[PDB]
PDB file of C-alpha atoms in Angstrom:
ATOM      1  CA  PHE A 565     -13.579  14.547 -32.183  1.00 21.41           C
ATOM      2  CA  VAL A 566     -16.113  16.476 -34.298  1.00 22.97           C
ATOM      3  CA  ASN A 567     -17.591  14.264 -37.073  1.00 26.90           C
ATOM      4  CA  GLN A 568     -15.935  13.809 -40.488  1.00 24.00           C
ATOM      5  CA  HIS A 569     -13.984  11.297 -42.612  1.00 23.14           C
ATOM      6  CA  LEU A 570     -10.403  10.777 -41.341  1.00 24.30           C
ATOM      7  CA  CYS A 571      -7.927  10.562 -44.272  1.00 25.73           C
ATOM      8  CA  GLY A 572      -4.129  10.475 -43.919  1.00 25.09           C
ATOM      9  CA  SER A 573      -2.781  12.873 -41.263  1.00 24.45           C
ATOM     10  CA  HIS A 574      -6.406  13.316 -40.153  1.00 22.32           C
ATOM     11  CA  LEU A 575      -6.392   9.625 -39.184  1.00 20.58           C
ATOM     12  CA  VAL A 576      -3.039   9.838 -37.419  1.00 20.59           C
ATOM     13  CA  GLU A 577      -3.781  13.212 -35.836  1.00 21.43           C
ATOM     14  CA  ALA A 578      -6.946  11.506 -34.532  1.00 21.08           C
ATOM     15  CA  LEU A 579      -5.675   8.053 -33.436  1.00 17.40           C
ATOM     16  CA  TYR A 580      -2.898   9.961 -31.657  1.00 17.32           C
ATOM     17  CA  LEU A 581      -5.584  11.228 -29.239  1.00 14.58           C
ATOM     18  CA  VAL A 582      -7.648   8.029 -29.160  1.00 12.60           C
ATOM     19  CA  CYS A 583      -4.541   5.955 -28.350  1.00 11.88           C
ATOM     20  CA  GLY A 584      -2.896   8.821 -26.456  1.00 11.34           C
ATOM     21  CA  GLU A 585       0.318   7.161 -25.201  1.00 13.91           C
ATOM     22  CA  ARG A 586      -0.635   3.594 -26.206  1.00 13.72           C
ATOM     23  CA  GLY A 587      -0.085   4.663 -29.829  1.00 12.20           C
ATOM     24  CA  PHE A 588      -1.407   2.791 -32.909  1.00  9.45           C
ATOM     25  CA  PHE A 589       0.196   1.205 -36.013  1.00 11.20           C
ATOM     26  CA  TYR A 590      -0.037   3.093 -39.362  1.00 10.23           C
ATOM     27  CA  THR A 591       1.029   1.546 -42.732  1.00  7.28           C
ATOM     28  CA  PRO A 592       4.845   1.774 -42.192  1.00  9.08           C
ATOM     29  CA  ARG A 593       5.395   1.161 -45.945  1.00 10.75           C
ATOM     30  CA  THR A 594       2.161  -0.412 -47.248  1.00  8.69           C
ATOM     31  CA  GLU A 595       1.253   3.101 -48.453  1.00  3.31           C
ATOM     32  CA  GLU A 596      -0.301   1.095 -51.316  1.00  6.42           C
ATOM     33  CA  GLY A 597      -2.782  -0.668 -49.011  1.00  7.19           C
ATOM     34  CA  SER A 598      -3.451  -4.422 -48.926  1.00  3.63           C
ATOM     35  CA  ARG A 599      -5.182  -6.924 -46.611  1.00  2.97           C
ATOM     36  CA  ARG A 600      -5.079  -4.397 -43.740  1.00  2.82           C
ATOM     37  CA  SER A 601      -4.878  -0.596 -44.195  1.00  2.00           C
ATOM     38  CA  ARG A 602      -8.241  -0.494 -46.030  1.00  2.00           C
ATOM     39  CA  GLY A 603      -9.536  -1.764 -42.679  1.00  2.00           C
ATOM     40  CA  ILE A 604      -8.258   1.320 -40.787  1.00  2.00           C
ATOM     41  CA  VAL A 605      -7.718   3.997 -43.513  1.00  2.00           C
ATOM     42  CA  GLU A 606     -10.658   3.360 -45.889  1.00  2.00           C
ATOM     43  CA  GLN A 607     -12.989   2.303 -43.045  1.00  2.00           C
ATOM     44  CA  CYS A 608     -12.431   5.705 -41.380  1.00  2.00           C
ATOM     45  CA  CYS A 609     -11.428   7.767 -44.454  1.00  2.00           C
ATOM     46  CA  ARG A 610     -14.061   6.136 -46.691  1.00  2.00           C
ATOM     47  CA  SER A 611     -16.670   6.144 -43.853  1.00  4.76           C
ATOM     48  CA  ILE A 612     -16.898   8.033 -40.541  1.00  4.20           C
ATOM     49  CA  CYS A 613     -15.675   5.332 -38.125  1.00  5.20           C
ATOM     50  CA  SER A 614     -16.530   5.881 -34.437  1.00  4.28           C
ATOM     51  CA  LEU A 615     -13.698   6.297 -31.905  1.00  4.92           C
ATOM     52  CA  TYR A 616     -14.473   2.711 -30.837  1.00  2.00           C
ATOM     53  CA  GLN A 617     -12.848   1.511 -34.087  1.00  2.00           C
ATOM     54  CA  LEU A 618      -9.974   4.018 -33.949  1.00  2.61           C
ATOM     55  CA  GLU A 619      -9.512   2.812 -30.382  1.00  2.00           C
ATOM     56  CA  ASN A 620      -9.251  -0.715 -31.825  1.00  2.00           C
ATOM     57  CA  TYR A 621      -5.786  -0.073 -33.347  1.00  2.54           C
ATOM     58  CA  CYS A 622      -4.384   1.763 -30.310  1.00  3.01           C
ATOM     59  CA  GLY A 623      -1.472  -0.568 -29.515  1.00  3.30           C
TER      60      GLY A 623
END
């Protein structure tokens, strides 16, 4: 996509394209964040992660 920090819907709205039909897994209830989450949300939201990383959760 363009180039900015993905936070919340911006992350989903983005992974949705990266994964296309493969889909990705978003915190189903860990909305608080724990071992994971900060790996996908903060990594991208906190820092501009390249599609390569967003493409890492497509599954």
